[PDB]
Symmetry: D2
């Protein structure tokens, strides 16, 4: 009737290390939260004060690459082919970034970003294989945010009386809406 307390002790070695791996991830992603959060807090203004767009974009765009670096400590910190093991840690972060970027470009140049750009722009691989990549589901979900965010924008747009800009946003949203209908539930 025996339990061998080596099977257990020998797992406290693995766990000890896993706690730590999972810790340095938690730590880097902690800054990337922090940075991104402030680009996001700034891009806030477009709802109350149209003039300010330009600068808010400028700032966002600064952060965005101030933290394409962080995605690089993080990058080397993830072992082997084990992205998906941890990917839970940088998914909400990576989504908010896609979203942010996507918003910027739309404000800036009035059209939808490509994954391949957001990729370059964060300094991330376009696919699985060549290294630490940007996951397609994330992209798609960042874009989802965008659409929701623009709806809020079109409505604020009207209350500040930029009636026609509102109408543009709405052409555009309805465009995503059909791009999305082209997919699923």
């Amino acid at each position: 009737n025996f339990v061998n307390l080596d099977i257990f002790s020998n797992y406290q070695k693995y766990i000890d290390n896993e706690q730590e791996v999972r810790e340095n991830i938690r730590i880097v992603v902690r800054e990337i939260e922090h940075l991104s959060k402030e680009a996001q807090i700034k891009l806030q203004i477009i709802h109350s004060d149209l003039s300010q767009i330009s600068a808010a974009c400028g700032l966002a765009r600064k952060q965005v690459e101030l933290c394409a670096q962080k995605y690089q400590k993080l990058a080397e910190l993830v072992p082997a082919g084990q992205y998906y093991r941890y990917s839970d840690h940088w998914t909400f972060i990576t989504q908010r970034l896609i979203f942010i970027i996507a918003l910027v470009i739309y404000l800036e140049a009035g059209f939808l970003v490509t994954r391949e750009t957001v990729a370059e722009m964060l300094g991330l691989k376009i696919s699985q294989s060549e290294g630490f990549h940007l996951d397609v589901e994330d992209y798609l979900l960042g874009i989802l945010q965008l659409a929701s965010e623009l709806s809020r924008f079109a409505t604020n747009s009207v209350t500040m009386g930029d009636y026609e800009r509102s109408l543009n946003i709405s052409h555009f949203i309805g465009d995503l809406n059909t791009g999305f209908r082209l997919l699923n539930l």
Copy 2:
């Protein structure tokens, strides 16, 4: 060292009955789902085909009172002062109804309903005390839906080219948005 299996058997009497009380609720609310669900499915059309509004409203408005009746079996089915004990069963239902009604009136007459109306309209008490009532949080949440639904409408509105109706919805949403800012997170 004794457990008295009467304390237990005597609770199988209460449980037996509670299962049943909770069952006849579940059953009525099952239809009210069913009915409401179809008003909701019909009012769907306003996004693809503006002409149809009028009829969709007519139908909704039929259902709405086809099931102000159901809220009456349900009404007498709930004992004592125990609304809140079960209220979990008719909360998502009651919310969708507020929402529906609210949408109708806005389409119909272009303004925000009063709780006191939705109340009369479902045949429900305006407050706690005079009997089976319409809960304020529910109302507020039905209205929340509305706002979200109208945003979708303003955007579809533009793709069908009713540019100015779109702009109206947006004045209105922004109106709720300030009514809501007047409250909390």
Copy 3:
């Protein structure tokens, strides 16, 4: 196309007050957590040190009535017939108390408590109607805890070598197990 911002302002009056009602509940229940938590932390000892039972029971039993008082500020703080509206706040608390009490008595006198006792013991009404009551589902769930806790106890019992006490706990658990089989899933 009008929203009347009185319908809204007039609800900030109700909400203001509800926040507050819900706040003084949150506050009392905050102590009852605190107290109970310490009886619970003490009754911990029975797993490592059998001698200590007696004192741990003594202490628990002190707390228990040090906070049959709190259930009395709380008591008068809840309006009308609106127990169930808030009952979500004191359910995990009230469960841990039933559990605690139940454990005490079993340790003390080796048998299962009656709801009617836990009731008197916390100074709570035996039913719905005569006032602030002890809810049957809670009781039953406190007892559930008990059974789970005793299983842990029987196993610790054996490692400290009180072989026969272990066997008693097991007669008793198996007794609840049939009391419970007498009910449902």
Copy 4:
């Protein structure tokens, strides 16, 4: 103001395929549920009828390898180094199997299995790298189940009066309990 509906159409190609990959997994794991579920349903008997253990073990042990095969369609069905991408599908299944196996051996030979065995026994790699592996967290969690299941067994044991077997289970549980204390919260 343009959305390019190729970026979208080109993703309906990837999604189409992902739905399908994720589908053939869902399908195999559907049987492994089915099989395992029945070994589990049989090993049930040890609580009511001690004689039967031997046969229940025999049966379990049959299933176990009737579905070390399934873990082989599944095996080749998972691409590249993407275990963790899908691993969500076979985690509750793989846990119940570890648990089952672990129970069998304990019943059979009265001691705790090694991961390396459960591995061989399901025909799974001992680590990450040499191929489709058995994840350490899963193992540990299957064992957790075991302990919980044995507690139930020790208590049933006593009601059928095998007093001393009960005491053995309890030495053993308390053994795991210290193996586990040797780890974390």
